[PDB]
Amino acid sequence: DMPVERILEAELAVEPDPVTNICQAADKQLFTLVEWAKRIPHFSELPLDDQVILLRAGWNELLIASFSHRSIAVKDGILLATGLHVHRNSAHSAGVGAIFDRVLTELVSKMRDMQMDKTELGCLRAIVLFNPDSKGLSNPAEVEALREKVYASLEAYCKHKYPEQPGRFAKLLLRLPALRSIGLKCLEHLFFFKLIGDTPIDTFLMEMLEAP
């Protein structure tokens, strides 16, 4: 019902001032985010209003997970979807070194150390997408059921692909609290950038930052 092959396919089909460049890439990736979600089993079957709720609720976390995994081979920096590389020093000189370092240390480095693969990354993003706690959901039970199907499939994949690593499934799930915290802090930075009005912000990113 929730094949890891379909999740892996959703991931690949979408596969591609430092702050201005980063925000430009984010706007670009929001469009592809929607296409990714549509490829996740059963997402498009949910009512439109709930699809909107799920994406507005998890887009920050969803995008951060994606560029972090893409940056696993990068030294002290991240690879943007636009092809640009952003180094730690550049982030620091731009005034966002603290959150940048959290991403490198809590996400990129952790993904690299355990060699997180694309299937696992896809499953974690699918788990993030199907967030039953999102406020306003018309049928939270259905979203909860979809999430449970994803982690059931993820655990089976881990036990099959990495039988010599029993705690791998849990290790993957335990990166979600860090992702949640970093996503919240990133959103705060975006709100601040908008308030000041010093950083260019494209239409789709602007809409996501627009109040309900």
Binding site: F31, V34, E35, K38, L48, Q51, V52, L55, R56, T203, F204, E207, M208, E210, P212
Partner: peptide, 11 residues
């Protein structure tokens, strides 16, 4: 409310 997101999802 969310012109862009709705369109991409629907159409």
């Amino acid at each position: 409310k969310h012109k862009i997101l709705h369109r991409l999802l629907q159409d």
